[PDB]
Amino acid sequence: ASKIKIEFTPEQIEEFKEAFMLFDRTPKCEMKITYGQCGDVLRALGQNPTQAEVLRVLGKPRQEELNTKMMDFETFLPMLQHISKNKDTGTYEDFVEGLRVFDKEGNGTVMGAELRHVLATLGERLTEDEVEKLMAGQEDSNGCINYEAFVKHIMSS
């Protein structure tokens, strides 16, 4: 699906492979890795793949294709590097400006429940427990989530 275009230093590939083995749930079939949950590691590898993008980087896999069948990541490694180098992401000030309009008082914060709702429903599909653990701690007494600090913590960590 993707051609070999750019390769980084092999030690970076080596540590990516090490993390994959960490996530490798196949004891004897360690050569093959999860087809669909590799995008979850790509999420964990300092990248932020959107749902549609993390789907068609895999050529529109099916749910059975996503989970049942296996795949060799090293074929996808050039495409993972391509996704990393696309830089199809906004900036921190861009993020805070975008989430600023989602307010009705301009206090520098956003109410928690509507933030969870838009994160789960308005945007890409995400389980709720994920959103409460995302703003776990970021949640305050009156619900006015500090969206600037929250988003800087997110993109930084």
């Binding site: 008082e105 301009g106 206090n107 520098g108």
Partner: peptide, 30 residues
Amino acid sequence: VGLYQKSSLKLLSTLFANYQTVSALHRENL
């Protein structure tokens, strides 16, 4: 004033966190 309470600076807010003629207050303080 209501604009002041919803300002970006916490300083301006805490000056106008709430809002007694001045002559009577001065006499009482004296």
